[PDB]
Amino acid sequence: EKNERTRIKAQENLRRIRRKQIDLVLNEYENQVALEVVAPEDIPVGFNDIGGLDDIIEELKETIIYPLTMPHLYKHGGALLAAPSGVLLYGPPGCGKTMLAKAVAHESGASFINLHISTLTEKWYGDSNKIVRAVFSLAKKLQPSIIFIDEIDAVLGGEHEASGMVKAEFMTLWDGLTSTNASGVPNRIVVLGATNRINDIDEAILRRMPKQFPVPLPGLEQRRRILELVLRGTKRDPDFDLDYIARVTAGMSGSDIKETCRDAAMAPMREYIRQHRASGKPLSEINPDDVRGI
Amino acid sequence: EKNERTRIKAQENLRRIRRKQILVLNEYENQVALEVVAPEDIPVGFNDIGGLDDIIEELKETIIYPLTMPHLYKHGGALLAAPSGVLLYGPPGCGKTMLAKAVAHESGASFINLHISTLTEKWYGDSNKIVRAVFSLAKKLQPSIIFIDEIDAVLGTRRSGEHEASGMVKAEFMTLWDGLTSTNASGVPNRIVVLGATNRINDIDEAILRRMPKQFPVPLPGLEQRRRILELVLRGTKRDPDFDLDYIARVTAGMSGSDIKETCRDAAMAPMREYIRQHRASGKPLSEINPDDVRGIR
Amino acid sequence: DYEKNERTRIKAQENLRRIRRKQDLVLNEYENQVALEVVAPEDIPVGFNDIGGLDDIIEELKETIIYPLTMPHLYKHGGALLAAPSGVLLYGPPGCGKTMLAKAVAHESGASFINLHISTLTEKWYGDSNKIVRAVFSLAKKLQPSIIFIDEIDAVLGTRRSGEHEASGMVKAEFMTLWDGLTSTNASGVPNRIVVLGATNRINDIDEAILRRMPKQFPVPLPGLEQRRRILELVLRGTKRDPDFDLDYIARVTAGMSGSDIKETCRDAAMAPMREYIRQHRASGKPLSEINPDDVRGI
Amino acid sequence: EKNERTRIKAQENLRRIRRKQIDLVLNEYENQVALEVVAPEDIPVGFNDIGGLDDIIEELKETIIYPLTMPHLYKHGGALLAAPSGVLLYGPPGCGKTMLAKAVAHESGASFINLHISTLTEKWYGDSNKIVRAVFSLAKKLQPSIIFIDEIDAVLGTRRSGEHEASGMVKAEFMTLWDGLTSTNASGVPNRIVVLGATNRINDIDEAILRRMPKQFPVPLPGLEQRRRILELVLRGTKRDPDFDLDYIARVTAGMSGSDIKETCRDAAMAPMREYIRQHRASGKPLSEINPDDVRGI
Amino acid sequence: DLVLNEYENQVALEVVAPEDIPVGFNDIGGLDDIIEELKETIIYPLTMPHLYKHGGALLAAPSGVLLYGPPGCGKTMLAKAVAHESGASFINLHISTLTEKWYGDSNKIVRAVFSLAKKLQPSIIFIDEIDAVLGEASGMVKAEFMTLWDGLNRIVVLGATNRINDIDEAILRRMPKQFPVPLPGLEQRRRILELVLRGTKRDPDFDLDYIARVTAGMSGSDIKETCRDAAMAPMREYIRQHRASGKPLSEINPDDVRGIR
């Protein structure tokens, strides 16, 4: 149990060093949560690779990344002009909120850690609750921390009191004897969330998360943005009426437009592979081209 | 407890030594490593499924080719990756699981047959661990394919009335399958396809359906696909000449693939029963090629 | 939480040893209970020569389920199309020989009949029901020429309501998957040599996906005229010879009675003479039975 | 947890010790069902306390008890002269069909277990089936036993399509354990377990349960003679005054069941003591006295 | 107050002792026939049972008495007095504590309360607004209640309702006594108000009919709520006089003007 735990702490040390450098001493519980620490260059997308979400993205910048990173500029404004202690991203599925979380992890650059539901659930008794202490202590040590819970229904409200204990301790250490620091700082740990079913999250997270951003479907020209964005590496040279494709996708979500673009791009490559499958070695270097075929 | 996990680990190590030929695993990746199946096991291939041929070319040119052997599809960037998943749906007995067996056999993509029994663990917080192990083993066996048959049971429309472990399984699955680290640092995301099959897509968790771009309907066989189902089912069954396959294909209209299989079974079982009833007046030695079907029975 | 496992494993090993010596394995914790469901042929005191009435269903079960399943060497020339049918569903009104057909199949087949009860499938903890449904087929495959029996299968394999329950729905899906899924055949193509016999009196409640997997569906009807007289003979084999009994009359007086109703009427008609003897014998000291009574009328 | 199970085990063991002689290893559900095996001396009623109806009270004693207990007289007939599979009492409320089952419990000495509706319905998935198996296995460990379900139409019932499916899945366990595969012995003798059930309605009981309760005795409203006998049995403690009679009371009350006559006689008996205490408030200290009248009180 | 399982513990939060109950018939009024009959038919068969030991189990306490009970103060409050004077160890039961969120939970509660009452040999089960018994899981709890009633003993079940016809036919069989508790429609309400005015007395006592005839159709709880505030109505003026006369001082001088409407 110690040798495997030693491998755990070694991998944690490597990951935390690669995060910090862009040292720390951790107990064996937060050497297991620090494995779920997302390095900055591990994300392929920034705020420029997202389309349609611009007012929400400026909200997340001006209220969640500036109040949480470089807070000295906000000493003039006082205390109310600061970052909340929790933000939520709700809306339909596929609309692009996990992508917002990914862009926040990449561009914000302040100790992002994504909590999976498995790291909160432990078979043994009690130690499934010390991991929440480890999460918050790690977020307090990695000072500009952004805790993230994707599909946030593990802290949703069989009860399984041990799981109830984990949820209650998460609520308590959310805003308890540590969320009101005498140093005039909340420690800058914004527990970002996300969920496509906003109703079932019962009451507590709805009061603990002041900012709640609805990621709608792209209405009438944000789908044009997502089309111009997904089709960034495909040769659409001869005749590709992008406005028609933006107008035909009536109520498709971002993932739906993305998969439609995937099919439309597979179309020329498919109809090329299906035609030159006779010379033996298929290469298919730059020969095909995109026209239509959504 | 170690006396059981050591035997388990030995078993999965032997299974993967059989499969991977032409790797460290934790206590959970092992328990899912018993699900990895080799193409030698499944006997069915794409050349054995009659009728639904339009779905075969779609799986080949849009799932298996983009997933296995991706060097062709590299010029188009991450847009030309394989789909996140596939959902084969239709009435029962039309070829969903048979397509699954063909994908297991005729792909060469480290097929992983995930049972509902293994996702659902008794101890607390082990179902989430089993899902994380499923997606960590599908990532180790890189161009892999996770197959959840009857996927509308494990997944499915979430509600307030459901076991607290099931909601965690669903959320953990969605997180691993279209989450933060579902794309590599270079941008090429995780050549892992979740192939599911169901006969009820209106109970399959639309948030999950968003993850499955390719949703193929396996329709009920028609007059032209039934004459291929009958051909495939009747391989070894030697036909008595004057056997009219067209009449049997036209009389079995409202039947599925399995119903046509069972009809052909009960039609080829007839001459053997005649053979048995005639040899009732003597001993029962080994069989022979004497009994031919008296006619095309239906 | 450990002695129960040792008790159940020793019991299942003893049971399997009994079935084997009627003519070992390493069973895990979950199929170690299903090994208790395995019944021996010497337990079931019923044979196909003991059922009455239905005779073209007995012929069907013998010819196209029992012979393909056990003793398959006669069918190794037709291929996988001559394998045993994956599923037989005996359906019909209550009390007309469904469970008796299952009992005769358990006794006469000699194919490792396993009487699966609805309790062993329904476990308390999360995932144990799925583990039991997997262990059923695992044990049936360890004992290849095997039959799985689920009496009153409609209450266990219902039509999959949209919000019925998760444990029941997962058990249904697990049973469907292990019935004929990815790993249901062999590496060569033999369909696993397992037949799950089900008995129900509500046919249109099983759900369509499951009736697909039981391709042979036998309606067990009510006894007609010649079936009622055969049921009467088979029931009255035990009673006295007769004191001028009339059986053709009783064969038609039982207008729409099922098999169990005919058996109960015969029970009452046989109890009547012993009651007469008890009444006439109370005047004496002790009962001390003999063979005085008769059998004439029961109505 | 473990302490609760051990306490239930100790209670069931003590109840078995008190029931056996006017030791058995058994699982937890049989521990819970063992808390219902009742001693015959725990009940005050007998076959002579049951006024009115006498044909039913003879049919039970002579075709359900003598076949069930004392089987050495019915041995020659074989499995066809065994005890009936089950017994059903039906009739309007208060006509003495639970008191009749109570007398069957007392005056039979046949391991009478009284199964409550709560013992069957459990909170966890798959515990009602465990307890049904427990009751049908404990009745077999107590071979000449009786299983009384009171208000059988509540526990059982015509299983609708859209039923609870946790009370309908237990409703099939009763049928499976009742008359199923292993519901006899290798020698061919039945299981000699008789299940007695009382109900106000038989058309709602079931269609598949009523065929295995072949003995069905209706407990009708008392006529003139039955009502007179019920009156003569209810008035055993009360002291008659030489003035009144019983015929006019037996004739006035017509639609009253057994329990309605019981409550009427209770009022008629409380009337004299009522008057005595009402004329005795400032009459010394009421401690004891015998001066009733039992005059005609409607 | 002894050993008991978790369900008897769940039901123990509603059980109360006799002495802890408020005043009995001395606390209420407005009826004499109903109180007299119920008293001499229940409290006597419970208090001093030695006087009935020669009866022979026939002239014992009734097994349950229903109440027609046009709604006033829960449509009845006689159960409190019956448990208080008889020392009956009043165990209460509500529909809220009778519903179920787990399968087979209401039946467990019913068996616990009846099992519970038996440890407490003298006991008064009380079904306020008894319609959860009559009448698809409620049928099972109905059958359970019927079976625990006499399905196989100094216990009484007080059933308050509002419609005799709505009760099941197998329930009126078990509740023989049908004590009607209608609204007070006579002049006796003044005595009601008398009791309702035994808390505090106004400046003089105004016209008794002036306060009586106004509540000619009001319920008993209606009278109790009117007089609990009408007499307090001018007292609010006295508190306002405290506020206007310097600061509020602890005084004991009542000053009524008119307690009506």
Ligand SMILES: Nc1ncnc2c1ncn2[C@@H]1O[C@H](COP(=O)(O)OP(=O)(O)O)[C@@H](O)[C@H]1O
């Ligand atoms: N606003 C958007 N612009 C561009 N692509 C988007 C957008 N929203 C979603 N997508 C596409 O959806 C895929 C993942 O969607 P995701 O953010 O996981 O949806 P959700 O927010 O429901 O989790 C990405 O590959 C991305 O291409």
Ligand SMILES: Nc1ncnc2c1ncn2[C@@H]1O[C@H](COP(=O)(O)OP(=O)(O)O)[C@@H](O)[C@H]1O
């Ligand atoms: N297109 C098909 N071609 C040949 N056989 C088929 C086809 N569809 C179904 N079958 C028959 O059905 C049986 C299994 O049915 P399956 O494909 O598993 O149904 P489902 O797709 O509903 O799971 C196989 O034995 C096969 O013989």
Ligand SMILES: Nc1ncnc2c1ncn2[C@@H]1O[C@H](COP(=O)(O)OP(=O)(O)O)[C@@H](O)[C@H]1O
């Ligand atoms: N075909 C039959 N021949 C003889 N007896 C029968 C037949 N069908 C039903 N029975 C009688 O029914 C009783 C058991 O019925 P069972 O087979 O359990 O009914 P079901 O098939 O509805 O479960 C037996 O005692 C038997 O005497």
Ligand SMILES: Nc1ncnc2c1ncn2[C@@H]1O[C@H](COP(=O)(O)OP(=O)(O)O)[C@@H](O)[C@H]1O
């Ligand atoms: N024939 C009878 N003789 C004497 N008492 C009777 C008779 N029938 C009913 N009773 C009375 O009714 C009570 C039993 O009611 P019961 O008839 O068992 O209810 P149900 O019929 O609804 O089960 C007994 O306590 C007894 O006093």
Ligand code: BEF
């Ligand atoms: F993350 Be997505 F909203 F399912």
Ligand code: BEF
């Ligand atoms: F697998 Be099939 F749809 F029943």
Ligand code: BEF
């Ligand atoms: F009750 Be039988 F099994 F139809």
Ligand SMILES: [Mg+2]
């Ligand atoms: Mg997401």
Ligand SMILES: [Mg+2]
């Ligand atoms: Mg399938």
Ligand SMILES: [Mg+2]
């Ligand atoms: Mg049966």
Ligand SMILES: [Mg+2]
């Ligand atoms: Mg009763």
